[PDB]
Amino acid sequence: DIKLFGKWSTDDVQINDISLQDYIAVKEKYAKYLPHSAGRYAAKRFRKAQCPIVERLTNSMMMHGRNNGKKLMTVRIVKHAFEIIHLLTGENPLQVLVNAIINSGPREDSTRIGRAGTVRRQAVDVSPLRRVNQAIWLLCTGAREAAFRNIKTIAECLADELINAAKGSSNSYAIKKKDELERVAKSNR
Amino acid sequence: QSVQVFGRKKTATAVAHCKRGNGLIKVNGRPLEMIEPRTLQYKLLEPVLLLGKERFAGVDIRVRVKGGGHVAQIYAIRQSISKALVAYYQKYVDEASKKEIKDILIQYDRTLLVADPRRCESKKFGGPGARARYQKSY
Amino acid sequence: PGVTVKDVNQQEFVRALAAFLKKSGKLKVPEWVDTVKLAKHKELAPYDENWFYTRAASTARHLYLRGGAGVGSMTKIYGGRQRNGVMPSHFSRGSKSVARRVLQALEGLKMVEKDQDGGRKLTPQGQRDLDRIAGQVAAANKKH
Amino acid sequence: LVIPEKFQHILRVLNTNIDGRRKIAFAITAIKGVGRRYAHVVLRKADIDLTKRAGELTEDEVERVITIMQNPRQYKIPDWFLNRQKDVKDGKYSQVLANGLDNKLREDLERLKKIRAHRGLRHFWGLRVRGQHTKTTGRRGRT
Amino acid sequence: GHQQLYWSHPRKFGQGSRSCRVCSNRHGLIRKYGLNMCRQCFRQYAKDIGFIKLD
Amino acid sequence: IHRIRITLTSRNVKSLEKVCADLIRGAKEKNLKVKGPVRMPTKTLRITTRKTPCGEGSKTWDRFQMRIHKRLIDLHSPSEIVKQITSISIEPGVEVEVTIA
Amino acid sequence: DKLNNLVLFDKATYDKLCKEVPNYKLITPAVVSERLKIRGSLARAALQELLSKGLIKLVSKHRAQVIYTRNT
RNA sequence: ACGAGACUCUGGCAUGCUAACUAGUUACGCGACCGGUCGGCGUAACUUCUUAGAGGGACAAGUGGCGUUCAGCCACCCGAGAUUGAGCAAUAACAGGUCUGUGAUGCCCUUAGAUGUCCGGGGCUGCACGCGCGCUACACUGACUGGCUCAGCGUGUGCCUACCUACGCCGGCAGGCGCGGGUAACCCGUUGAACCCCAUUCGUGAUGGGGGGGGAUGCAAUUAUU
């Protein structure tokens, strides 16, 4: 009753967030099972924190004009490769999911500052919410653009992007875009 | 005369008439776990493993559904079932474990007792939809 | 625990109704399976070669659900959005000559009882056989 | 368990060695007279096993399909349903496909351009005949 | 003969002749409900019939 | 026969309420097997009108509502009583029709 | 810009699909067409024949998503 | 003082009251295997539903915090709702549009020589940056075929009105032979229209992915209106 779907145990889960868990709550009764409860939390400041990561990522991968509104296929496409990472890691996929997500958020961003100076902007740390949202959106963008006219098949590629980001190797779209952005910002300090 | 507090999600309304029975539940001439898309199967599964089968063994519930959309019918069927259970099991037997079960409901999902207020927004002229206006020629 | 026309996953219910009826052989097979296009919104042939049997199963199920389902109703079941080319796609029904052929099929096999004021109703014995195939599909996976 | 003899890398029917890599009955879309509904219905009614591999096709299948494209009346295709239905010059209901003259039969435009009819008097300069609004547009291929 | 000398031409889609009758123009006519009045007079006699605006 | 219907229609609410007051007064005069008023849904029509004849300025489609409201009453009563109740110089603006089907 | 697969009969008839695949932890028809440059027809036929042989565990099916693993 | 606001309507508001089988309303041996699904049938059930007239509810009053501790603001507990949308929308003016809504009105051919009265041919469908949201779709998220499961609350029979196929069939549409149940919640109806467990195919490529004669609304298919 107290575990996700009746299969994903939520009791012996990992801490894995030290204090970023205030943003993402999947370790108590605040963790719903299915990534679908309608988009009802996007109506006040910080209600996104209550929302589970799964639902947010399911909602996100539905864009680019070709995925405008159709969401049940998104839920199917995430449950697929959710099972893939689950059975490749053998344990609860939460650790690997969080590892992939937190390895993708750009550590710093070069925001344009100054009156009229565009030649030097400021490298500032990024907020955890903006970081995780941009990471999810950009990895979903990479997954989509690895699916049009590409020999890979969608609903299986995101599993490898997830496991690669969890490991951190540079083959993945999300972490490589994050690292190029990071190096651009380091030039800018 | 009667409460029959029903359940509404968006424009889709489902009402669960509950009376003394064996605990089995029917949704529109049909038991539960045979939904055609079978992607929101666990969504309809939610109440039974939320509150427990030991409370769903003494009440016959009949659900009637009407309203557009695949998902919109859901999120109201389960709400209707839950609120009918609250109503029937409150008006007769006891109030302490009533507080217990309604509290369990609230901590899992407040929507199961209270309905979603927000609905569609009317479209105004000069554009394709409600807020969006047409392209300005330049 | 009894049987019902829809208690099982209706997929296997209708599939096994069509298969049972084709192995039983009582229903006749149509003469043309290609000359008609089966739909205005469809510009190419079906891919079953027993789609008459499939449509008969579908209309039998839909008449079990709700009576009075006279002709002019099943034509909308397979009808849908018609790609009119550059024109916006509107709902167009299927070619109703095929629905008329299936109407010829139901009549004379005692499948349906008609009336002058419109509509048609399934035979109680017919629903007995429909509950028999329902029992077969139920005992396949859920009453075994 | 594959057939070990006669097997060719190129699926050959009409004596033009196109790439035989394509799976069965999907390579007949290039014929100027058989396509869309006709080609698809005559492969789907031919009782072909599309799950077969390239190296497991048999001479029986290619022979039977050759006969079926040779004979138009294998399953009583109607005349209004026929490909060259009530065409100009002569009325022929036989399914015959050969290069050199078939496209000339398709070239009934000789008469329409010679009698300089409305369509012909349009086509003298190369003006559109289906209402495509190209008042000044139409830059695809016109630089 | 007489049928070609005069009136050899009808108009069965006539909107100009069967236009909005009460005033002397063709435009501003919609064929629902029997309007036969321009939008300017449609508004000028709207509230008189019972028309109200709430949207 | 005991199958007589009356259909009243108007665009005003207080007019229909005073008509229902007339009917309840008649029912108070003598108790008869006359059923309650049938409140048809408030039937709305939308009409939308461009105002700038030539295109010059905004697309201000005047949105006018025609909301007709309908009340039914089916009566099984002697004719004289209901005729006296009804034919009492009814209010202008509310349209009443008596039907025998 | 160009990539070509093989639909011919070679070691792909038996090898790396009859005895080498069970060493994996997850099989996917797209992965088979990646490791061997094959088509969907071959993927479905090979999965069906191998399952009839009886060394494979089902997961689920879709028009483009049919999932299996090894169990023996 | 006008304007803003209040004000009106609108989804939240029958958790109680105004109460029609014609739309829906658990009770009522039959049909179904022998006790559990048919919307085809029966307490004329004294209306909770979607059918609505009254009445009610929410107010920054509750708490905490910030504020020059005033106006106020944020968070939290609650509640259907802690900002829903539109409606009405200044004084004054633009040298704006409309006489092409109008026989009052700036007007040389307006002495009834023609723009339609009477004809409709060629085209704003003719070609070059040439200003115009109008460009559905644009492919393995999806194109095929159908196993399939869901309110438009848009509305659809007209004083000199004539244009909305049940019951059976020939058919690719219409075509019909009596024949679209109704002046409408009666008749279209429980208006099975749209992402879906795919019901053969298309496992990475411009390809399966938008894609010249005819049988027939009106006086005439024409640069395929349809």
Could you please report the per-residue DSSP string of B50-98? HH-GGGSSSEEEEEEEE-SSHHHHTTTHHHHHHHHHHHHHHHTT-SHHH
What are the structural domains of chain F?
Answer: 1-101 (3.30.70.600)
Using a CB–CB cutoff of 8 Å, tell me whether B30 touches chain C.
Answer: yes
Residue of B nearest to F63 (CA): B125
CB nearest to A87's CB, from G26, G30, G33: G26
Using a CB–CB cutoff of 8 Å, tell me whether G55 touches chain A.
Answer: no
Cβ G67–A155 below 8 Å, yes or no?
A: no
The two three-digit tokens of residue F39, written as one number: 């409140």
Residue A65 sits at the vertex; the CA angle it makes with A60 and A69, to the nearest 5 degrees, is 55
Say if strands A122-125 and A108-111 run parallel, antiparallel, or are unpaired: antiparallel
Q: Which residue is nearest to nucleotide H204 (CA to C1')?
A: A151
Burial class for A76, CB neighbours closer than 10 Å (0-12, 13-18, 19+): middle
Cβ A87–G25 below 8 Å, yes or no?
A: yes
Report the distance from CA of residue E41 to the C1' of nucleotide H8 in Å, as an integer: 25
d(CA D53, CA D24): 8
Using a CB–CB cutoff of 8 Å, tell me whether A113 touches chain B.
Answer: no
Spatial contact of B4 and B88, defined as CB atoms under 8 Å apart? no
Residue C72, CB-side half-sphere exposure with 13 Å CA sphere:
5
Report the distance from CA of residue E10 to the C1' of nucleotide H218 in Å, as an integer: 10
Reduced to 3 DSSP states, what percent helix, strand and coil does chain A have, rounded to the nearest 5?
45, 5, 50
Three-class secondary structure of residue C80 per DSSP: strand
E30 Cα to chain F: minimum distance (Å): 11
CATH code of the domain made up of D1-78: 1.10.8.50
d(CA B113, CA B105): 7
Instruction: Please report where in the chains the tokens 């959710």 appear, as a residue.
Output: A82
d(CA B19, CA B22): 10
The two three-digit tokens of residue F86, written as one number: 């009804």
List the determination method. cryo-EM
Spatial contact of C79 and C37, defined as CB atoms under 8 Å apart? no
Complete DSSP assignment for E10-37: --TT-SSTTS-TTTT-SSS--TGGG--S
Using a CB–CB cutoff of 8 Å, tell me whether F61 touches chain E.
Answer: no
Cβ E43–F11 below 8 Å, yes or no?
A: no
Using a CB–CB cutoff of 8 Å, tell me whether C143 touches chain B.
Answer: no
Q: What burial letters (b/e) apply to F22-38, b meaning 16+ CB within 10 Å?
A: ebeebeeeeeeebeebe
The two three-digit tokens of residue D10, written as one number: 């190129």
Report the distance from CA of residue B114 to the C1' of nucleotide H58 in Å, as an integer: 17
Classify residue A49 by its DSSP letter: G
Cβ contacts of G52 within 8 Å, gap of 6 or more: none
Residues of each annotated binding site of E for Zn(2+): 20, 23, 38, 41
Say if strands B59-66 and B25-27 run parallel, antiparallel, or are unpaired: parallel
Domain spanning B1-138: CATH 3.90.850.10: no
d(CA A106, CA D125): 61
Spatial contact of A36 and A58, defined as CB atoms under 8 Å apart? yes
Q: Give B126's contacts in chain F (Cβ within 8 Å).
A: 58-59, 61
Cβ contacts of B17 within 8 Å, gap of 6 or more: B4, B61, B62, B64, B84
Within C25-83, residue ranges assigned H as helices are 51-65
Classify residue A4 by its DSSP letter: B
Cβ A1–B43 below 8 Å, yes or no?
A: no
d(CA D56, CA A82): 38
Domain boundaries, chain A: 4-187
CB nearest to G28's CB, from A76, A151, A156: A156
Domain boundaries, chain D: 1-78, 79-143
Spatial contact of A121 and A132, defined as CB atoms under 8 Å apart? no
Do D and C share at least 3 CB pairs under 8 Å?
yes
What are the structural domains of chain G?
Answer: 3-72 (1.10.10.10)
The CATH number fitting domain E1-55, selected from 3.30.1360.120, 3.40.190.10, 3.40.630.30, 4.10.830.10: 4.10.830.10
Give the H or E element holding residue B45: helix B41-51
d(CA F94, CA C13): 57
Classify residue A118 by its DSSP letter: -
Cβ F11–E50 below 8 Å, yes or no?
A: yes
- As beta bridge partners, residue B66 has B13
Which subunits sit against E, judged by 3+ Cβ pairs under 8 A? F
Which amino acid type is present at position C55? R
G27 Cα to chain D: minimum distance (Å): 20
Resolution of the determined structure in angstroms stands at 2.9
d(CA C31, CA C101): 10
Spatial contact of B17 and B84, defined as CB atoms under 8 Å apart? yes
| Residue F7 phi, psi dihedral angles, 5° rounding | -115, 120
Three-class secondary structure of residue A108 per DSSP: strand
Cβ D40–C49 below 8 Å, yes or no?
A: no
Using a CB–CB cutoff of 8 Å, tell me whether C82 touches chain B.
Answer: no
d(CA E20, CA E16): 9
Three-class secondary structure of residue B26 per DSSP: strand
Q: Give E43's contacts in chain F (Cβ within 8 Å).
A: 49, 62
Residue B70 sits at the vertex; the CA angle it makes with B68 and B72, to the nearest 5 degrees, is 65
Q: Nearest nucleotide (C1') to the CA of residue F101?
A: H186
- As beta bridge partners, residue B13 has B8, B66
Domain boundaries, chain C: 1-144
Spatial contact of G48 and G54, defined as CB atoms under 8 Å apart? no
Cβ contacts of C87 within 8 Å, gap of 6 or more: none
Cβ C7–B29 below 8 Å, yes or no?
A: no
Cβ contacts of A178 within 8 Å, gap of 6 or more: A104, A105, A106, A107, A135, A138
Using a CB–CB cutoff of 8 Å, tell me whether D73 touches chain C.
Answer: no
d(CA A89, CA B66): 43
CB nearest to A155's CB, from G3, G59, G65: G65
d(CA A40, CA B109): 12
Report the distance from CA of residue A117 to the C1' of nucleotide H68 in Å, as an integer: 39
Spell out the SS3 assignment of G3-70.
Answer: CCCCCCCCHHHCCCCCCCHHHCCCECHHHHHHHHCCCHHHHHHHHHHHHHHCCEEEEECCCCCCEEEE
d(CA C42, CA F101): 47
CB nearest to F65's CB, from E39, E43, E52: E52
The two three-digit tokens of residue C63, written as one number: 């008449």
Spell out the SS3 assignment of chain F.
Answer: CCCEEEEEEECCHHHHHHHHHHHHHHHHHCCCCCCCCEECCCEEEEEEECCCCCCCCCCCCEEEEEEEEEEEEEECCCHHHHHHHHCCCCCCCCEEEEECC
Bases of chain H with protein Cβ within 7 A: 8-13, 15-20, 22-23, 26, 31-40, 47-54, 74-76, 79-81, 84-88, 96-98, 100-103, 117-120, 124-136, 138-156, 158, 161, 165-174, 181, 185-186, 189-190, 192-208, 210-213, 218-219, 222-225
Cβ contacts of E54 within 8 Å, gap of 6 or more: F65
Within chain D, residue ranges assigned H as helices are 36-44, 59-70, 102-106, 109-114, 118-123
Residue B113 sits at the vertex; the CA angle it makes with B107 and B118, to the nearest 5 degrees, is 105
For the CA atoms of B30, B32, B35, B41, the dihedral, rounded to the nearest 10 degrees, stands at 170
> Among A37, C3, D133, which Cα is nearest to B9's?
A37
The two three-digit tokens of residue G68, written as one number: 């299996």
Q: Give B122's contacts in chain F (Cβ within 8 Å).
A: none
- As beta bridge partners, residue D66 has none
The two three-digit tokens of residue B102, written as one number: 């309604």
The two three-digit tokens of residue A65, written as one number: 């004009």
Residues of each annotated binding site of E: 20, 23, 38, 41
How far, CA to CA in Å, does D50 sit from each of A92, C143, D26? Answer: 41, 37, 10
Domain boundaries, chain E: 1-55
F22 Cα to chain E: minimum distance (Å): 23
> Among A15, A10, A49, which Cα is nearest to A33's?
A10
d(CA A29, CA B92): 30
Classify residue B137 by its DSSP letter: P
Q: Nearest nucleotide (C1') to the CA of residue E41?
A: H101
Q: Give D49's contacts in chain G (Cβ within 8 Å).
A: none
Report the distance from CA of residue E14 to the C1' of nucleotide H218 in Å, as an integer: 11
For the CA atoms of C39, C42, C48, C52, the dihedral, rounded to the nearest 10 degrees, stands at 0
Residues followed by a break in chain B, C–N over 2.5 Å? none
A119 Cα to chain B: minimum distance (Å): 33
Residue D15, CB-side half-sphere exposure with 13 Å CA sphere:
3
Domain A4-187 top-level CATH class: mainly alpha
